Design a binder for these strands. Structure first.
Ligand SMILES: [K+]
Length: 88
RNA sequence: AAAA
């Protein structure tokens, strides 16, 4: 599953990129004030669900990332996550 | 879901 994990990792890192975040008003509305989102919400996005429905592989893919941080069931951008949340 |  190593190649599939790499595709999932890079797809989710795109969502958490600055270039995406500047326009991704839905993602930012769903963040809590600390920048965290449910990993299961990310799992529902079309390009992730195309690759897998195995939540364990999604967690494994993201543990490897230098872009995002996992706390329990939630994920956020590591760099300055508090700048991005928006009102629901 | 214009890579939510
Ligand atoms: K919010």
């Amino acid at each position: 599953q190593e190649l599939l994990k790499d595709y999932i990792k890079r797809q989710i890192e795109y969502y958490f990129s600055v270039d995406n975040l500047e326009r991704d008003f839905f993602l930012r509305r769903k963040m809590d004030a600390d920048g965290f989102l449910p990993i299961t919400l990310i799992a529902s996005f079309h390009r992730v669900q195309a690759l897998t429905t195995d939540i364990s592989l999604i967690f494994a893919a993201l543990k490897d990332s230098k872009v995002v941080e996992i706390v329990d069931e939630k994920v956020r951008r590591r760099e300055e996550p508090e700048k991005w949340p928006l009102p629901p």
